[PDB]
């Protein structure tokens, strides 16, 4: 299997983790 | 573990047939002997006999090949199996190879072929197909 699919999935995962890091305190205070 | 002795018998026959063996041995039981009887009487196998084994008895089957080494059996399929079992009435008995094959049916009158069961007006469990 091409590593292209792994690359797409990893970019999605990395962006989501970055978003989670950027809004940790906001999420904690809203929940 | 072993679940279907009948299917194991059929697969021993099929595997020996593909390998052009002249001989196939397996543990003996009444049902397997009756299936061997039907196969021999219908001319699919050469001959069968039952020796005795170390514990019980064995079944020995001679495979029939033509002069140019062409197999006398074209296929062997198990129809009714543990889990999903198949029963047919006397009127909707299956046809094998458009009638060119033989379907073995277990009726209360014993083991019969599809044509015998149709002629006698009986039904039962469809054990296997031979063609």
């Amino acid at each position: 299997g091409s590593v292209i699919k792994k690359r797409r999935k990893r970019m999605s995962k990395k962006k989501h983790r970055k978003l989670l890091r950027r809004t940790r305190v906001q999420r904690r205070k809203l929940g | 573990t072993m679940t279907d002795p009948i299917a194991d018998f059929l697969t021993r026959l099929r595997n020996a047939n593909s390998a052009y063996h002249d001989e196939v041995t397996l543990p003996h039981s009444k049902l397997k002997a009756n299936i061997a009887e039907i196969l021999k009487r219908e001319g699919y196998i050469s001959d069968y006999r039952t020796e005795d084994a170390r514990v019980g008895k064995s079944l020995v089957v001679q495979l029939k090949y033509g002069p140019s080494r062409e197999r006398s059996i074209a296929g062997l399929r198990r129809v009714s199996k543990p889990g999903l079992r198949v029963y047919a009435k006397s009127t909707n008995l299956p046809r094998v190879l458009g009638g060119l094959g033989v379907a073995i049916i277990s009726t209360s009158s014993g083991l019969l072929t599809d044509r015998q069961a149709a002629r006698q007006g009986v039904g039962g469990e469809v054990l296997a197909y031979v063609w």
């Binding site: - | 219908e42 001319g43 033509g66 062409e70 006398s72 074209a74 190879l97 458009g98 009638g99 060119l100």
Partner: protein, 168 residues
Amino acid sequence: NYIERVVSINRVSKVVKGGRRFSFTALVIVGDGKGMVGVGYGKAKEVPAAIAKGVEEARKNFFRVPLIGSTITHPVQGEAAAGVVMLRPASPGTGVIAGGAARAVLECAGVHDILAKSLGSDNAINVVHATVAALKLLQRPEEVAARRGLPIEDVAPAGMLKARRESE
């Protein structure tokens, strides 16, 4: 008299430093309509030449189909590569019910009434191969009776027997 069926022309190409070199491939069927068929696959730089090579290849490789009057003896199912074609005999007057590749092969083979369906790999070459493989799985009743060493009436049903009678 021979009936020919050019079932597909394809333009294939190989790459070179200058560019693309296009050739032509033709899949043809050759038969007499009486029970003999053959399949050829020719390639050339020109379509008529490829057709000619396919025709001669199909003529060289012939194969007799076990007809019974106007149809095949018994249902079969043949598979070659990923193509799966199922064949089923039909009552007289039904006609050929098949797709383009199967229809070409069966009409060249002389089969008049048959139900045929393709169940995989719509590619024409492989469907033709699967149809030929299915037609090679048919057995005449005499051969079957010889195999099991039984009279022809014991093995075949009465339905097949008189169908041979009326045809003969």
